[PDB]
Design an enzyme around this catalytic site. Structure first.
Site, mmCIF file in Angstrom:
data_model
loop_
_atom_site.group_PDB
_atom_site.id
_atom_site.type_symbol
_atom_site.label_atom_id
_atom_site.label_comp_id
_atom_site.label_asym_id
_atom_site.label_seq_id
_atom_site.Cartn_x
_atom_site.Cartn_y
_atom_site.Cartn_z
ATOM 1 C CG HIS A 169 -1.509 1.320 1.535
ATOM 2 N ND1 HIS A 169 -2.639 1.790 0.900
ATOM 3 C CD2 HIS A 169 -1.183 2.246 2.476
ATOM 4 C CE1 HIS A 169 -2.997 2.942 1.449
ATOM 5 N NE2 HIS A 169 -2.128 3.239 2.408
ATOM 6 C CG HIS A 174 0.644 6.672 0.558
ATOM 7 N ND1 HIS A 174 -0.228 7.718 0.756
ATOM 8 C CD2 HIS A 174 0.234 5.678 1.381
ATOM 9 C CE1 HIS A 174 -1.129 7.371 1.655
ATOM 10 N NE2 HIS A 174 -0.872 6.138 2.048
ATOM 11 C CD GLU A 214 -4.757 6.372 2.848
ATOM 12 O OE1 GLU A 214 -5.140 5.398 2.199
ATOM 13 O OE2 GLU A 214 -3.615 6.412 3.312
ATOM 14 C CB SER A 233 -3.021 0.065 -2.316
ATOM 15 O OG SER A 233 -3.884 0.441 -1.239
#
Ligand SMILES: C[C@H](O)[C@H](O)C1CNC2=NC(N)=NC(=O)C2=N1
Ligand SMILES: [Fe+3]
Length: 308
Positions: A169, A174, A214, A233
């Site tokens: 993730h 990110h 997010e 993700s």
């Protein structure tokens, strides 16, 4: 009084001593709960974050074959979607991550190499983090273009699932966005907005982060794409977020900041950012409404926050 906040990048070191000591890997319903080997592996990664100090290179770790396998599965199934689902900044940088960082199915990139690479892109850097930081400390790091990044990987029994952030993730979600200038600046604005901010407002900033960093959607010309790391993700939610099912609203901070959400199912609602520069502007304006008897500015030349 005004809550404490780091004045120099080195002071971020105070965080590793303020995390949640009893992590999710200890819960009965965690995919790796009954696996004592996994349990020790997690502790080993936690010890690396615990003893890390700003300025030190990030320890390299030899990943087990089983761990490299879990990464392979997550990498291959997610990669097929990026070309058509991830926003431009993501695709523009992914190939570079592939050439210079070892982003490949059979290799888990080392955080040190990823950190150096982000540094030459936008000055962003990573630091290994043990587990979940408070929102105040997590967001605080962003003001210094610092991202607390997990280094352990989800349990191999459920490769397409994780109840917490894990390395797949952080790297696939990110990292590609922190390589973009505009995004870098936008995420930093969130960080700056949190320094010395009251708890009730930190929560509002956490909620804005949720709906942008997010699970954000970006406007790309006449089309829409995902830039939110939680989306990038998640094989399932990445395809879903661009389907006809979710409800989309334009990013509007007074509303976005108080909008509820749950992290258990696909999001019913997403906010669309006009662009990273614009979201950045909106945060700055939103930050102006937060009651702080002062102003903050980060000075990249000295790596210190200036308090006015
Ligand atoms: C930013 C917002 O508060 C998020 O819920 C948080 C809080 N703490 C966190 N801590 C860590 N280590 N990684 C995260 O992604 C994270 N996200
Ligand atoms: Fe995340």
């Amino acid at each position: 009084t005004v809550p404490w906040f780091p004045r120099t990048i080195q002071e971020l070191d105070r965080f590793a001593n303020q995390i949640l000591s009893y992590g999710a890997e200890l819960d009965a319903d965690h995919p790796g709960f009954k696996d004592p080997v996994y349990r020790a592996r997690r502790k080993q990664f936690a010890d690396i974050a615990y003893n890390y100090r700003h300025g030190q290179p990030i320890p390299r770790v030899e990943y087990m074959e089983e761990e490299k396998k879990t990464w392979g599965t997550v990498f291959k199934t997610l990669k097929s979607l990026y070309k058509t689902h991830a926003c431009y900044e993501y695709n523009h940088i992914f190939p570079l991550l592939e050439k210079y960082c070892g982003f490949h199915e059979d290799n888990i990139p080392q955080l040190e190499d990823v950190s150096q690479f982000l540094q030459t892109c936008t000055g962003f850097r990573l630091r290994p983090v043990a587990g979940l930081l408070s929102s105040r400390d997590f967001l605080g790091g962003l003001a210094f273009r610092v991202f607390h990044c997990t280094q352990y990987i989800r349990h191999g029994s459920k490769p397409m699932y994780t109840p917490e952030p894990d390395i797949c993730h952080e790297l696939l979600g990110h990292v590609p966005l922190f390589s973009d200038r505009s995004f870098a600046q936008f995420s930093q604005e969130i960080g700056l907005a949190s320094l010395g901010t009251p708890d009730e407002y930190i929560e509002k900033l956490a909620t804005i982060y949720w709906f942008t960093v997010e699970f954000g959607l970006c406007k790309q010309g006449d089309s829409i794409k995902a830039y939110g790391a939680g989306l990038l993700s998640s094989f399932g939610e990445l395809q879903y977020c661009l389907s006809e099912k979710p409800k989309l609203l334009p990013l509007e901070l007074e509303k976005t900041a108080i909008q509820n959400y749950t992290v258990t199912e696909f999001q019913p609602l997403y906010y669309v950012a006009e662009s990273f520069n614009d979201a950045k502007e909106k945060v700055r304006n939103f930050a102006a409404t937060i009651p702080r008897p002062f102003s903050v500015r980060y000075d990249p030349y000295t790596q210190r926050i200036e308090v006015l």
